[PDB]
Design a protein around this ligand. Structure first.
Ligand SMILES: [Fe+3]
Ligand SMILES: [Fe+3]
Ligand SMILES: [Fe+3]
Ligand SMILES: [Fe+3]
Ligand SMILES: [Fe+3]
Ligand SMILES: [Fe+3]
Ligand SMILES: [Fe+3]
Ligand SMILES: [Fe+3]
Ligand SMILES: [Fe+3]
Ligand SMILES: [Fe+3]
Ligand SMILES: [Fe+3]
Ligand SMILES: [Fe+3]
Lengths: 150, 150, 150, 150, 150, 150, 150, 150, 150, 150, 150, 150
């Protein structure tokens, strides 16, 4: 792939992720409800901004962002699933953390690609998002009792 | 129908509308770009909050909100379409207004349904979101040079 | 009358009331000057906002608000009179209170009217305005040494 | 039986509830201490404001609120009890929720009453308080690992 | 004439202008709706403060402001007209600017008169209001495509 | 007694006092209504804070605060009484002041006791609350036309 | 006089006035205590700033402000007197008003003198302080039941 | 002496100190102008508040604060002198610090006294103001190149 | 050229661009006046800050920024021209966009250069500014009805 | 000359002054660096606003402001010079003050000119700007150890 | 010992405590991660402030605070240990609580120490920190499921 | 070495630098006391945040930060020394700058290292810290009268 394609792919991913954050936020139950319920609100807003920025950066480089659920569904690498069976807090966090891991890894690809193609601006955006993802990964893993790269 | 079904249907609608708002805002062009670009950010946040509140009111009455793009696409009455052909700001606003008119009319049904079933709380929520939609409809129509209900 | 006419009649009353608030505010004298001087500023802003909201709700339901002193003068049920003879703080308060009671009473009609006509949004607006007027009526009557409905 | 009586009964209830929230707040222990400790502070202020509003709405419709612990004790339907045995976070939350459910249910009666009696303003206040109680009920039940209408 | 008469004449003018601002604000339609709708709100507040100031300055020099729509209508030099025939945005702004021009010019007379009279305080007030009017006039004319003194 | 007993006795007093403050706030009438009505809101919050702090200081030194209206009623030295007869603003303030003087005097004992006993921290708290009470006592007496120490 | 001398005379006056404001602020008693007590705090700050500004303006035009109580006492035209026999709220306000009047009249002289001397800057300062004093004079008079120039 | 006398004595000193601070503030020159000019504004406000607090504490304990420059001059231990000769920033600071040392030492007496007298509240006030003075003394000394107790 | 030279060249450009932004800001006319007038204010401040940061980064790497209009005029690559003829909002916008495009392109060189030189800090500054210019370029093009890369 | 010409001349002056403030800000060294570095940031913003205001006042009276560095250079009376040989803090401040003195003096002219011409508004602007310049002149002079008019 | 020695010993302790707070903050894991992670940030800041205040109070009484890790390590009574083995949230909290009890107990000594020495200021300092420590000890113990005094 | 090692080494350096900043802050004396005293508080906060970020970054890449003074002392390259003899402000600043220079140079290494290994996130962090260090280096050097790279 090329930058435009990489970027649009993230537009799709980010839209799926965001809905996933909402699912966790609405369905969670357990002693950590209060704290994690608010934390999801924070994630939602943060990833919603990554999303608009990625989309806007694409537009700025002459691209055209996907902009319908159908397109997002067709393009995303992030997986989603309806909430049927109830799920443990940890189960939900594990799904959150997994998606973060996916985004971290894809961003890594975009980062190197962008660097090789000499799109310095997109490169730096991706880096900054990664930085954050990494910190979240460390935090959600500690919540789950695990080491970050564990 | 029933309140729970009504509300869930709106969670689906709201998620489609919200992406539609982003589409407009990303793709718009013309002399009204700056002002309308920002207006869409406002709409996005507002509808996004209506969405969270409808979902949370459903949860509170014992329901289970849809929570994946697939479910939203499967259940929404709001229509969406990929942005292929360039459209006019007015064309874009006309799409927005149409969707607002759809929501208005559906809420009106929810308003009576919820009334008929005696759920005073859900009833008042819908009324307050309706009040806002009506004001937006007046403003967007004025933007387009039209009377609100014309 | 119908919703549109009721609302426009209130646009007229609200514009008269607002000027009346300024009158008291400018002409008042007595030991309570400071406090009441400030309270009127607050009433003025609140009533001015009800007024804009009533007019915008009208506009939203397809109406056309009166918008000239002459029309307000011609349609208001609220009475006004030039300040000639000096008047006491209590006399001023009594005028204020009476106007409040008129608004209350008229709002109550609009409330029945809109309930019967099914305009849930306007119904709620008026109810919220009434809620406030009732509270002011209690407070100004208490200032005057009276019971609210007494 | 009547709105005034209904309202005053809630002034009593609200006073008992508020002290119960402090009890929880003071005596809780457990891993959820920090979070729930602060959440109680928020409940305390919120119910304290409901209380002042109900009492002020009462005064405004010509009533006279109870205003001594003795009166509150004599009229409350909300139950209280000295903290002797050390209870569980969950036990404390279960008392809190139980009380919320009681308020919910009684407000529902008041809604209905006020509705039959024509007091639109009091009707709307109660509805809004209900909306909030319902949300809390959803949240505290999630905390306890239960569904709201559990 | 005299300062007192001048000032009171402005209280009348200011009140008619303020209502005229609301008319434009309520009835405007066209692509500039968003922006101008908000700009009128700003004008409304500004002129409403000039109004209270003028009236309070009059009161301070021992005068008695007019304080009824009737008085305002009887003394205003500013003209008003019911909105019957739907007007262009430009037509509305042209009415605004014309009124601004009228206030400018009358203030100029009050500055002279006040000057001659030796009421330094009133003189400075009027100057400061004129400074603002002049800036508006430049802005609204630019909006209309014209030079300020054009 | 002992610090712990002293402290819990204040929790009881503080709870009665706070309800008394609401009584005054609700039932007051007269020309000083607006000002005193808000002053009471301030007293309510302040004393409400002294109360949580005394209780928490108790908890911190190993004590167990009373936490039910029944307990408060059984232990308070502050007196309360249903509002039956209409009373004077001065009468109300005189009740307020009398209660402040009681608290002042009891804290004085606590301040003494507490120092006997070596509890520096509790000593300092009480001193700071006293400082405040003393100031209120000066102001309310001035309001009443009296010197502070009567 | 001469601008420098005039300004330094006001540094003196302003210092006396400011302490007078504290006197009233400290010794007042009566039903208007809360309100006037706070108003005096407001006056104190304002006049304290006029003071600093006058002194700094003098410094800026090459002068040297008085800067000791002794110099203030020796130069002030504003009169002060120890509080021995108690006074009424009205008596205190009357003293306040009288001093305001004195400052108004002296500023008027400085306004002329500063004008005669071409010190446009000092001229404008004085006018702005005069505007405020005039307003205060109207308000305190209204508090006293009098017309401003009465 | 007695607490009342001690307190009043400080009202006098504080008033002379405050003017002194202005003096330094107005007349200073040198490279440290901007910084010290602003620091004096801070000291002015701070001591001004100590002053009002001392006075009000006096009032609260049944005293009567001095409240005229004449009284202040008559009772102060703090020394003042017109600014004739050019002084140094260091000279000015040295005067400031000296005055600070005086207040510190006198508070120390007020402190022992209040202790002995059992006026816990006054005692604590003084200790807090002392704390602040001590810090200032440390900082101004450091500015001057000296150790604090140097 | 080298980092220092590149930076200094940008201090000159930035200074010319900033005055160009004020020219547009002052001279524009047309229906988009209010909105573009304000947007120019935003650009002015933003570019103004890039400028001070570029200058300060130069100073930090041991350079010496140009600091007179003469030097700016002598070194700038950005073109300026007196406003003689009345241009269209579009013409003005086009001039703005073309300058943005020039800055974009030159920053790109500096990015590369700063890179070849291994000045990581400067490299990142430039990238960040570029990111913003790119966004601006997208927005003003959209305003003009064009795609970003033309 | 005439108002327009005077104003435009100031546009040119103000533009040179603003760049000179940056030069000082950038090149300054010495113990006063932190404080003066920040003061210049304040001067830069202030004068930059005077500049925009002068320009907009010109536009408002029918003028056309210079708007290119070339025109600024061709019309300014304020002198600039490239920084080659280092210069003391004092030398820098001396340059600053000299320029302030020039603006002070020219404004004085404009002040009288505009008075001659009857442009009250422009006249008041200039006066207010002059008031600020005078105070700065006092402060910078004090910093340099001199009297304001020395 | 003496107050200066006592204080300095606290400087060392406070610095060790602070680092330990970070250790906990960085290494914690488990479901309470979010909440405790933030809580540690708060303690870090609070204790860091006590630290500077103790140091500055020492400097103010003529002392010389330790100011190097070496000194802190040499003087502290608080114990620290590298995080090797994996610890429980509870274990971590237990370590925190233990250190808090140590500080509490040492402050108690400093309280008596400064009291016999008659340093009222230092005495009050310590008291206020103690107050806070005691509250924290209650909270962390409840978190651990324990009563405060163990 | 490797990123982990590098980062941990900075954790150690940052903690030593932070304590050094407090030393300077506490011990400085001279005319610049006020300004630099505050500047160090700024540096202390800044560096304390760099420190927490570095540590969290480490943790996030799977590392384990040093977390005891002992470890810091053992690993830091930043030197520290007890304050025995009085030193000049300049001497203090020179120690500060030297440390800044050290961190700058070490970060440059980290920058290189982090890049060879391609840890883009850590690389950008270091770059951003460097940017700030460089600026501080330019400013403290100017303060010392030197050029940044000397
Ligand atoms: Fe966006
Ligand atoms: Fe939510
Ligand atoms: Fe509006
Ligand atoms: Fe209330
Ligand atoms: Fe007013
Ligand atoms: Fe609490
Ligand atoms: Fe000052
Ligand atoms: Fe006071
Ligand atoms: Fe700068
Ligand atoms: Fe502008
Ligand atoms: Fe400090
Ligand atoms: Fe952290």
């Amino acid at each position: 792939v090329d930058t435009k394609e990489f970027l649009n792919h993230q537009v799709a991913n980010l839209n799926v992720f965001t809905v996933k954050i909402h699912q966790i936020h609405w369905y969670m139950r357990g002693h950590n409800f209060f704290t994690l319920h608010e934390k999801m609100d924070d994630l939602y807003s943060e990833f919603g901004e990554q999303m608009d920025e990625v989309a806007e950066r694409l537009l700025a480089i002459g691209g055209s962002p996907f902009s319908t659920l159908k397109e997002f569904l067709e393009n995303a690498s992030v997986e989603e699933a309806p909430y049927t069976k109830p799920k443990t807090m940890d189960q939900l966090m594990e799904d959150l953390v997994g998606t973060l891991e996916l985004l971290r890894d894809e961003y890594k690809q975009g980062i190197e690609l962008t660097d090789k193609e000499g799109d310095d601006v997109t490169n730096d955006m991706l880096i900054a998002f990664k930085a954050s993802i990494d910190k979240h990964i460390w935090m959600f893993k500690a919540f789950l009792g695990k080491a970050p790269l564990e």
